[PDB]
A paper describes a structure:
In E. coli, the BAM complex is composed of BamA, a β-barrel OMP itself previously known as Omp85/YaeT, and the lipoproteins BamB, C, D and E (previously YfgL, NlpB, YfiO and SmpA respectively). Taken together, the structural analysis and mutagenic testing of BamB suggests that its main function is to bind and modulate BamA, rather than directly interact with nascent OMPs.
We report the crystal structure of Pseudomonas aeruginosa BamB refined to 1.85Å resolution. The crystals belong to trigonal space group P3221 and contain a single paBamB molecule per asymmetric unit. The model was then refined against a native dataset to 1.85Å resolution. BamB adopts an eight-bladed β-propeller fold. Four antiparallel β-strands named A–D constitute each blade with the A strand being closest to the pseudo-symmetry axis (A1 thus refers to the A strand of Blade1). Despite these irregularities in the inner strands, the propeller displays a central pore that is about 20Å wide at the “top” and narrows to about 8Å at the center. The structures of paBamB and ecBamB (E. coli BamB) superimpose with an RMS deviation of 1.8 Å for 286 matching Cα atoms highlighting a high degree of structural conservation despite a relatively modest 30% sequence identity.
Author numbering: 28 to 382
Write the structure that this text describes.
Amino acid sequence: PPAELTDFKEEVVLSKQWSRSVGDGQGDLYNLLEPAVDGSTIYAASAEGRVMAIQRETGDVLWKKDLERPVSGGVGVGYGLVLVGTLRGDVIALDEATGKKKWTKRVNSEVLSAPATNGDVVVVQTQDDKLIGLDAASGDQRWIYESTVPVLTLRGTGAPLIAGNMALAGLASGKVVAVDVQRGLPIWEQRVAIPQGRSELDRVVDIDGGLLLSGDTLYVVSYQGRAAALDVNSGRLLWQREASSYVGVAEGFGNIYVSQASGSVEGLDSRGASSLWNNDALARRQLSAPAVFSSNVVVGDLEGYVHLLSQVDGRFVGRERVDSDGVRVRPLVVGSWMYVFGNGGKLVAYTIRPG
């Protein structure tokens, strides 16, 4: 039973600029569809197959597309495409400016995360730990990286990231890899997660490394029950923490901030050595990954609240109910704006009052 909400002295108040419903949001997915921004537009998909492009400051709908099929991985955007994956293993590319379908490629396995693109190749990470590179123009397969090698009881829900000429991925098997984005050949591989054993051969578990790319640092914080940061160019371990682990991580003010779904949020130093503060009060509230919005750390919970915590102290300074079906997706902060995507599909844009 989630911990009851606690009283606090309100110091930070959100101003709701616009809200738009996109389909059924996450529907019955166990994984998450994440909206993404490119320039002045925010793009969002829903489990029912509805995809939208919205002017991110006004809320004006630029285009909608009803794909009429089970979208399970999404939004990828860039270089003129919006990209989603389906539970049937389809990767569908839509024109970023009009929403017109450009192509569809049926891939080997379910796609449970947003494809990435550099405008030449679309990189798709599958439930069964393959990275597939597709031609951005046609969808035709360019390369495949399959060290998978199993396993039927894990689902990888990590999204691939393009750094330079590298595609990075945290695989369900617990290994982070960097491959050549043009050829699909490995550049480095680094085991971060604790090795699997058996005795979870009778259960299906979803695995995500919780990747966050910031410059030369790739944070990998969501493998149980460890957390690490890697050099993006070599895979070298910069630091690690045992006895974790975290729903996700965010940077701000020279520190990092983590949440643990089970209901703590914590600030740590740059190198995750020492703890700056810890707020336990959201005990069983099933937190999203954290975002830093101005001087606040923010997390969504199962009841649909976003909580704002002081970056200095961890104390509650703000709270806003967004979508009562819950907020599981990391709030998306772009400068002075924050976009929260509720489980029922409410996409809401906030600024901090009086701005």
